[PDB]
Amino acid sequence: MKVRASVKKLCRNCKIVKRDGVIRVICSAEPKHKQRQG
Amino acid sequence: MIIATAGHVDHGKTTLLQAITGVNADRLPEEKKRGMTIDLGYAYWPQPDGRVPGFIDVPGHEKFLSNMLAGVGGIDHALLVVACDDGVMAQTREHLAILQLTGNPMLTVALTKADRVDEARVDEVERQVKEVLREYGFAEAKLFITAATEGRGMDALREHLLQLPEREHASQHSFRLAIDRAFTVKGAGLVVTGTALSGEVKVGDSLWLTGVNKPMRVRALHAQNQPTETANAGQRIALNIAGDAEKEQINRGDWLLADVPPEPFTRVIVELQTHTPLTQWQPLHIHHAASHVTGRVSLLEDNLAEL
Amino acid sequence: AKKVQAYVKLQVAAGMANPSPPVGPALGQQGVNIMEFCKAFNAKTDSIEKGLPIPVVITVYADRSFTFVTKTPPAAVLLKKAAGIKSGSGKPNKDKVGKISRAQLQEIAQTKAADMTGADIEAMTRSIEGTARSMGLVVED
RNA sequence: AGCCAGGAUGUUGGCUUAGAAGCAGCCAUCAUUUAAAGAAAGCGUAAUAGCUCACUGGUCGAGUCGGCCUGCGCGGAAGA
RNA sequence: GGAAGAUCGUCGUCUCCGGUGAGGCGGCUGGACUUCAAAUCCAGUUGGGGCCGCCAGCGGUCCCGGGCAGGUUCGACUCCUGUGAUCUUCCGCCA
Numbered sequence: 001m002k003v004r005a006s007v008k009k010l011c012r013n014c015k016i017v018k019r020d021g022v023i024r025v026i027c028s029a030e031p032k033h034k035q036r037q038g
Numbered sequence: 039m040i041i042a043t044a045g046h047v048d049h050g051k052t053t054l055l056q057a058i059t060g061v062n063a064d065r066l067p068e069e070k071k072r073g074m075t076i077d078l079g080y081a082y083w084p085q086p087d088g089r090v091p092g093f094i095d096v097p098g099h100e101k102f103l104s105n106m107l108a109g110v111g112g113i114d115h116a117l118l119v120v121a122c123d124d125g126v127m128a129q130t131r132e133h134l135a136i137l138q139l140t141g142n143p144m145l146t147v148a149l150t151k152a153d154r155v156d157e158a159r160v161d162e163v164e165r166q167v168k169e170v171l172r173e174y175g176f177a178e179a180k181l182f183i184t185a186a187t188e189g190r191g192m193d194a195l196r197e198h199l200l201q202l203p204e205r206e207h208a209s210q211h212s213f214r215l216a217i218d219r220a221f222t223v224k225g226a227g228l229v230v231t232g233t234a235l236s237g238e239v240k241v242g243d244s245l246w247l248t249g250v251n252k253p254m255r256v257r258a259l260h261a262q263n264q265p266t267e268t269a270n271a272g273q274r275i276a277l278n279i280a281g282d283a284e285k286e287q288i289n290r291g292d293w294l295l296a297d298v299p300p301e302p303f304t305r306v307i308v309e310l311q312t313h314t315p316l317t318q319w320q321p322l323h324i325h326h327a328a329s330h331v332t333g334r335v336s337l338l339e340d341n342l343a344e345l
Numbered sequence: 346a347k348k349v350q351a352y353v354k355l356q357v358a359a360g361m362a363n364p365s366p367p368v369g370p371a372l373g374q375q376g377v378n379i380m381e382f383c384k385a386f387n388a389k390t391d392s393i394e395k396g397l398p399i400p401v402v403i404t405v406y407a408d409r410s411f412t413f414v415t416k417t418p419p420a421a422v423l424l425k426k427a428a429g430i431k432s433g434s435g436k437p438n439k440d441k442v443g444k445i446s447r448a449q450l451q452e453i454a455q456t457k458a459a460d461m462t463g464a465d466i467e468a469m470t471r472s473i474e475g476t477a478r479s480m481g482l483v484v485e486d
Numbered sequence: 487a488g489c490c491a492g493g494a495u496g497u498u499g500g501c502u503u504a505g506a507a508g509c510a511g512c513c514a515u516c517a518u519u520u521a522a523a524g525a526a527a528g529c530g531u532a533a534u535a536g537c538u539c540a541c542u543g544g545u546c547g548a549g550u551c552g553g554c555c556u557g558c559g560c561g562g563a564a565g566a
Numbered sequence: 567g568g569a570a571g572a573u574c575g576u577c578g579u580c581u582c583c584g585g586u587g588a589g590g591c592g593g594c595u596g597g598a599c600u601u602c603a604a605a606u607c608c609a610g611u612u613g614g615g616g617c618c619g620c621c622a623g624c625g626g627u628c629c630c631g632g633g634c635a636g637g638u639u640c641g642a643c644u645c646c647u648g649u650g651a652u653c654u655u656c657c658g659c660c661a
């Protein structure tokens with residue numbers, strides 16, 4: 001989790017999802033890549 | 039009838055000794071503070087019969103092994119306590135191997151924790167012990183299954199205790215004493231306690247203390263909580279001695295004996311018996327009764343070695 | 346002898362039986378007898394020349410041994426010792442390591458021809474030579 | 487697009503050797519078995535096993551790929 | 567004895583170091599070395615071991631050396647576990 005304003009994809013398993021209207025990044029295999037509010 | 043108790047730690051060996059003798063083995067505050075037998079403690083069982091069997095409780099720890107090695111000198115009989123809960127422990131098997139190598143004439147296996155286990159486990163551990171005896175080349179052994187807190191096996195144990203030989207010694211042997219615990223009592227000097235390998239001693243006798251290299255007159259002695267004018271080999275001997283020697287030079291594993299030894303030698307040959315063969319010129323611990331040494335072994339013909 | 350378990354084509358030079366520093370325990374991790382990798386290891390070793398780092402297939406099973414077959418010497422060092430000049434470049438376009446001719450390597454490689462893939466003999470020839478030319482040597486043509 | 491399967495061998499590849507073998511790089515910058523096979527796009531690891539992916543097949547059955555101009559909205563946006 | 571701690575090279579001190587051991591510092595022995603010094607390097611601290619020819623009073627073999635042993639780990643003085651040894655401090659030495 002990090003609130004950085006630019007949430008570019010980092011691994012192939014990273015995928016954008018819009019939850020509660022804010023978009024998220026979740027890299028299934030690699031938790032550290034998880035991001036917020038791009 | 040000296041019976042030294044050995045076995046893996048906290049398997050009731052102290053409880054057994056309080057059951058038979060009721061002696062408090064602890065002496066140093068730390069072992070009192072920590073509740074374990076950190077170091078050797080002694081029990082004795084005086085009787086109207088006039089013999090006092092000797093009891094030596096020892097740590098089952100390898101770092102503490104150097105003290106147990108202090109206690110294994112002069113044993114008449116060895117009793118390895120084994121809790122029925124886990125059966126024989128690895129420390130117990132180690133002690134069994136050490137007794138087989140030392141050539142102890144006989145040893146008794148005493149099974150504890152018997153009340154907590156069902157009898158089926160009793161017979162199973164009994165079988166397992168009787169198999170292990172053959173593994174170590176043990177001949178006679180009398181297995182006693184008992185809850186020492188309950189006093190269960192006491193009567194069965196008694197007959198065996200009376201069976202145990204006290205070693206005889208020929209009158210013609212140079213007196214030899216292995217020092218164990220040197221502690222002054224405020225009365226009358228040093229009194230150092232140790233096992234007598236051979237010979238008799240009296241208060242008028244002069245002895246020769248090794249490692250201090252000084253003669254020492256005997257002030258007094260107690261045979262086994264049994265003060266007397268004379269002492270014979272085959273028991274722990276409290277020995278109160280005078281002379282120029284002082285505790286700073288005194289060391290456990292120093293010998294007290296009738297005449298000045300020729301000076302100690304590092305090199306020695308030894309017959310080997312081993313569960314598996316040793317290799318030439320390798321570092322190892324030499325452990326002798328009350329003696330720690332470090333040395334390298336070498337192989338000569340077959341089960342012959344140079345230390 | 347059984348379904349796939351261990352085997353891959355990897356081993357050191359044929360002069361080192363059961364190597365300890367690059368490998369040691371790593372070769373003993375599974376249940377093949379160590380003897381296979383020392384005594385039977387010299388079988389292909391001195392059969393040709395000592396210390397040919399031929400990869401060997403050994404499917405370690407729990408069922409005593411596995412068939413010994415030390416097959417193909419690696420082409421890389423084979424294009425060193427066979428050419429005779431062990432040195433090279435690693436700079437394919439930036440320098441020319443040297444030159445041999447079709448007569449040596451094209452004849453040498455045929456010993457491996459039974460195992461090497463190819464449509465025809467020359468499919469293997471250009472395939473090795475395209476690798477050998479890319480080794481920085483410019484072979485005669 | 488899923489689903490089902492493949493996705494080589496000389497490959498511990500010249501240098502440079504703890505070892506970099508598709509997996510920093512010297513350099514991989516070939517070609518070939520056939521469907522291609524990246525002298526390799528990810529990770530795993532000292533690098534190989536290991537799985538993947540690009541890539542080439544099979545099932546499926548009607549629409550589908552990735553950008554440019556774009557108009558309007560979202561985050562970035564905390565004070566008494 | 568017990569608990570905890572420091573140290574244990576390959577001449578000493580230190581930096582160390584997991585890529586294969588190296589280096590900074592130092593004392594001394596000489597050489598190159600001057601009238602002596604000083605300095606620079608060189609050369610060197612040569613170490614041990616089972617065994618050998620031995621008493622050869624020594625010299626070799628192979629092997630090893632960060633006290634020694636053990637394991638990693640792919641590879642250890644290097645990481646770590648022990649092991650003692652010396653060394654620091656403290657707990658009690660109760661026939």
Ligand SMILES: Nc1nc2c(ncn2[C@@H]2O[C@H](COP(=O)(O)OP(=O)(O)NP(=O)(O)O)[C@@H](O)[C@H]2O)c(=O)[nH]1
Pocket residue numbers: 045046047048049050051052053054073074075076095096097098150151152153154184185186187188189
């Ligand atoms: N159920 C049961 N438990 C027992 C018996 N005897 C001893 N124990 C257990 O053993 C514990 C005491 O062990 P102790 O005798 O001090 O051990 P130790 O073997 O003498 N110590 P060390 O080996 O160092 O000399 C008691 O707390 C008790 O739980 C017994 O007869 N029955």
Ligand SMILES: [Mg+2]
Pocket residue numbers: 048051052074075095
């Ligand atoms: Mg006890």
Ligand SMILES: [Zn+2]
Pocket residue numbers: 009010011012014027033
């Ligand atoms: Zn990512």
